[PDB]
Amino acid sequence: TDSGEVETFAFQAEIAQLMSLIINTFYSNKEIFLRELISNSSDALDKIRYESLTDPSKLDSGKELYIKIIPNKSEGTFTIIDTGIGMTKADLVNNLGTIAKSGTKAFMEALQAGADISMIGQFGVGFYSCYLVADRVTVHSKHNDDEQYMWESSAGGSFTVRTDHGEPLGRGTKIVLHIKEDLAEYLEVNKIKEIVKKHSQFIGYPIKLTVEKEREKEKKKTIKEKYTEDEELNKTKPIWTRNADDITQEEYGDFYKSLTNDWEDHLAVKHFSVEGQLEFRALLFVPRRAPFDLFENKKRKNNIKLYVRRVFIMDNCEDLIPEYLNFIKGVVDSEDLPLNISREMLQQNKILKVIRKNLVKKCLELFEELAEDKENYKKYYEQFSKNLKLGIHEDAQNRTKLADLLRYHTSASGDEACSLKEYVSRMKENQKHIYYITGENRDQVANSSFVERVKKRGYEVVYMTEPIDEYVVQQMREYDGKTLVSVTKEGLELPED
Amino acid sequence: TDSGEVETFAFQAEIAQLMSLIINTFYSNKEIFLRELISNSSDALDKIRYESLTDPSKLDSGKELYIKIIPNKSEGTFTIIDTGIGMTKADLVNNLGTIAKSGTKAFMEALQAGADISMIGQFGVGFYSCYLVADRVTVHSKHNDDEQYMWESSAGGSFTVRTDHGEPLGRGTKIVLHIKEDLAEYLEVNKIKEIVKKHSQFIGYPIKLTVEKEREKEKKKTIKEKYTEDEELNKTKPIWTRNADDITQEEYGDFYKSLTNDWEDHLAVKHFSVEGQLEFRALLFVPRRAPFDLFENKKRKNNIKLYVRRVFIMDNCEDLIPEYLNFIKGVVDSEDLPLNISREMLQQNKILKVIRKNLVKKCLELFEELAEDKENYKKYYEQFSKNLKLGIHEDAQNRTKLADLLRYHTSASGDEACSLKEYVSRMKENQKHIYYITGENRDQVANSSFVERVKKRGYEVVYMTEPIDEYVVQQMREYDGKTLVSVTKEGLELPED
Ligand SMILES: Nc1ncnc2c1ncn2[C@@H]1O[C@H](COP(=O)(O)OP(=O)(O)OP(=O)(O)O)[C@@H](O)[C@H]1O
Ligand SMILES: Nc1ncnc2c1ncn2[C@@H]1O[C@H](COP(=O)(O)OP(=O)(O)OP(=O)(O)O)[C@@H](O)[C@H]1O
Ligand SMILES: [Mg+2]
Ligand SMILES: [Mg+2]
């Protein structure tokens, strides 16, 4: 025989190193624990909502659904308040006290038909990002079924649970974090506000931020802090989920204002969706003014923001759009892109290319859609005439539509530009090829002898100065079945009757 | 307190979901699988080299140390054989059969006196990255003291091992793969060569991509190919690990031609090294000509590459160098950066900023070196004058240190370049003004007669290469206590002694 003895062994994971690996290696910034906590709190809230819509018996005690963020400056304790499904004994024993395990996955195993709910917690190791900002963790939990219970662990290798005997919650869970002394600056209200606004702006619930009212016992000026900022910043309701049919202008104009900090509305809207293998909506808006980052060539563009399940992920627009279309500002909202471990970067680049093709087709069709208004189209040309020419220089698929998009200054139209098809409209039978010229200004070449021969009869010539167009004439070799003729392609042209 | 009784349970880790996460979530692309195997082979080679250094009597089992790669399109298998330290049964089960447990860390901590040896690998997850494309893995190994075994797994949460009776390897390990039938393009020779060239270029051990066939011998009917040769595999030794004095001009030229694609030599070189709390080595190059894609600056900033422990990581320069250093080419090789689990991104950035400032200072030091050679300095300035004024507008911190480093073709300098630094030798006692004219490029506005009064003094009007000089003179308002003057500024003032 060759190999008679056979032995088998199961895979084991050395624990002690593993939580260290999870804490200090996976996540780029320490600005991420709050997002994870808000995510699984929202998951529990959606669990409550779904199990309550079918049966109101489950929804007892507090009907209102909300999330409270409580930073305690005096003690450094970070308190999180949610009113979700809560925990049980087995829940805290298994679903949180063991790595590589998530409750949502086991929840889908019971709901296998018509699950019209959007959860975010699939991976199962996103809870431990809290150890990045704290030394010890405290979880207050109370199910609608079982009692109140304590989760406590800080040593990394052991945990403690005990039956609660303190204030009762009745419904929901409460998260308490012992923030680290060195990184105590996270307790600043402004920092928390900015992190919430950036990473989880549209979670979809009331984020009240009802921080504890710091009691300060005593014509006289009144006190200024009746309550902390329970405004509609963390409570911003707009999720843009409404269908496009009933959508009006001003509300999405203010939506664009909020997205890009702009004071004015946008220029055009392309609200649509693509289904099948890659299901997603999208909101593309045309910025009104040119981008001033021309000097800063390789600034990381934030024009398009990618949202996965109503959660901001990445703003790297460079791999998401062709560079000749790197000025459109808007939002893409997919729902099935497979995210990596950090929920920060994508994995499938061919999916990105498919989205690229769909987006460019739709937005170039939009370019056609806005072409019917002369004033807005001349504004668009004057503002971003370069990008179409860059595409015509170095894009191959849609050169025809881009060529149709261009307009050009001519003779009989004055200083108003005209499309290449306009000259075809006034084309004469005896001429078999389009005449054009290269010149810095219209009038200087108008008197030039290179077209003075044909000026006696009053023909029309394309006037062309911007150097991209100096180099693009090779790119389009024939439009509408007629080759281009210049005073340099063949010299002084001689059109004869 | 004595209110709620406490109970403690040990931590647990779920196995199957953990490896599903490892396989499908960590690494962005599937090509990385080869790099981890190459790194582990280099690890084994370094281990056996150190064992030889402390005791050379035990290398009788094998003398040459190399990495041998044997692809096979016919069987769809991948083979990597190396002659490093090897495995043992306990090491087998407790390192390959254990997640996140690295024997490299154990060996590295076991010995401390020999800090010279540089080791790569501290996490215990890279070896399982080979499951990205391989449906089955079989590993052969034998120690200098242990017998021959194999380790076979199929990612099914179970593995088996037994004794060996096949081909007796003298020393080292052996990797056998069976890749997916739809990924056979990664068995192609050219693709493997490209990947090896990009990633593991400077490992420092022979990699012999060789598959040799016997050829029959006989009229002009048929002729086939013989074998696969090392496509410049490990023929480029690490330059930075060698002292600067021992590297001469042709070595730098060849290295620059290899790193880039340009047929030309380097315009200038600057090699330096920094030690202490932050230890790294760097190499800098300046091209002999302006970039061919200077007009097409849309290409992302990948000019400077980074290699921690002789492995490429990333060429994103938005955090490594300021953008007005666009044309610099080179490689930075550190030793102690905190790599994440993907080994593509870095978390802490203060090190990045200090490296940036050190590199800026070193680049300015190289700048000074070229200033002595007037002709080469003039050539480089007329080649790359734009980024200087760009940085002058941006870098307020280095504005003064760059202020004295510009030659200038001026009104009375002609083709010869006169510098404001050389000018200070020829100020009169009353002169407190600097004469120039800004614009997009050389223009006829310079022939204005606003400096007729100063024309008796023969003071010199400077030409400005690019429009940012309009903002540059808005950034530098006064040089070493001397004011400014021009047609654009005031036309003509009347300061006199
Ligand atoms: N209201 C809640 N707040 C926080 N955690 C909760 C809440 N309700 C349930 N949980 C627990 O959160 C833990 C969830 O997920 P884990 O952190 O395990 O998954 P993730 O996909 O890695 O991250 P996350 O779910 O946090 O987005 C689950 O095991 C679930 O039991
Ligand atoms: N080809 C090999 N040569 C030598 N040791 C090896 C080899 N393959 C695996 N090992 C050993 O088994 C353990 C496996 O490593 P893994 O590849 O699991 O982590 P690493 O090699 O330690 O680090 P990383 O993979 O993160 O770079 C390693 O730490 C190394 O000690
Ligand atoms: Mg979770
Ligand atoms: Mg390794």
Burial of A248 (0-12, 13-18, 19+ CB in 10 A): exposed
Query: Torsion over CA of B485, B487, B489 and B491, rounded to 10 degrees?
Result: 80
Task: Kindly list the residues from chain A whose CB atom is less than 8 angstroms away from the CB atom of residue B4.
Answer: 150, 162-165
Say how many CA atoms lie within 13 Å of A308 toward its Cβ.
18
Minimal CA separation from B458 to chain A, in Å:
35
Beta bridge mates, A324 = none
Beta bridge mates, B152 = B138, B160
Residue contact B28–A345, C-beta within 8 A: yes
Ion ligand 4, residues whose Cβ is below 5 A away: B 40, 121, 126
Written out in words, the top-level CATH class of the domain with range A406-485 is alpha beta
Beta bridge mates, A152 = A138, A160
Is B102 assigned a ligand-binding role in the annotation?
A: yes
**Which of B293, B298, B316, B349 is the best residue to mutate to test the A interface, defined by the most A CB atoms within 10 Å of its own CB?**
B298
The CATH code that applies to domain B401-486 is 3.40.50.11260
Tell me which DSSP letter residue B94 carries: I
Sheet holding A434-435, edge to edge: A434-435, A482-485, A478-479
B170: Cβ contacts below 8 Å, ≥ 6 apart: B61, B62, B83
- CATH architecture of the domain B16-209 equals 2-Layer Sandwich (3.30)
How many angstroms separate the alpha carbon of residue B198 from the centre of ligand 3?
Answer: 38
Q: Gaps after which residues in chain B, C–N over 2.5 Å?
A: 218
Which of B32, B38, B43, B79 for mutating ligand 2's site (highest number of atoms within 8 Å of CB)? B43
Minimal CA separation from B453 to chain A, in Å:
36
Domain A249-372 coded CATH 3.30.230.80? yes
Residues with CB under 6 A from ligand 2: B 36, 39-41, 43-44, 84, 95-96, 102-104, 121, 123-127, 173
Domain ranges for chain A, please list them: 15-199, 249-372, 406-485
Closest CA to B341 of A20, A100, A97, A311: A20
Is A347 assigned a ligand-binding role in the annotation?
A: no
Name the CATH superfamily housing domain A15-199. Histidine kinase-like ATPase, C-terminal domain (3.30.565.10)
* Cβ pair A160, A153 in contact under 8 A: yes
* Cβ pair B58, B52 in contact under 8 A: yes
Q: What's the token pair of residue A81? A: 């308040």
Place of tokens 């060539």: A297
* Cβ pair B198, B75 in contact under 8 A: no
Of B162, B165, B166, the CB nearest to A6: B162
Minimal CA separation from A12 to chain B, in Å:
5
How many angstroms separate the alpha carbon of residue A121 from the centre of ligand 1?
Answer: 6
Q: Gaps after which residues in chain A, C–N over 2.5 Å?
A: 218
d(CA A35, CA A62): 25
A356: Cβ contacts below 8 Å, ≥ 6 apart: A320, A321, A322
Which of A26, A39, A43, A203 for mutating ligand 1's site (highest number of atoms within 8 Å of CB)? A43
* Cβ pair A196, A207 in contact under 8 A: yes
d(CA B236, CA A172): 63
Phi, psi of B125, rounded to the nearest 5 degrees: -120, -15
E strands, B323-379, where?
Answer: 329-334
d(CA B352, CA A459): 63
Place of tokens 């308190």: A79
d(CA B157, CA B88): 21
Residue contact A345–B14, C-beta within 8 A: no
Distances in Å between the Cα of A455 and the Cα atoms of A131, A430, A432, A463 are 79, 16, 17, 14
Q: Is the CB of A120 inside a 6 Å radius of any atom of ligand 1?
A: yes
> How many Cβ atoms are within 10 Å of B322's Cβ, its own excluded?
19
Place of tokens 């996490």: B123
Q: What's the token pair of residue B459? A: 């003071």
Closest CA to A162 of B3, B92, B422, B427: B3
Burial of B321 (0-12, 13-18, 19+ CB in 10 A): buried
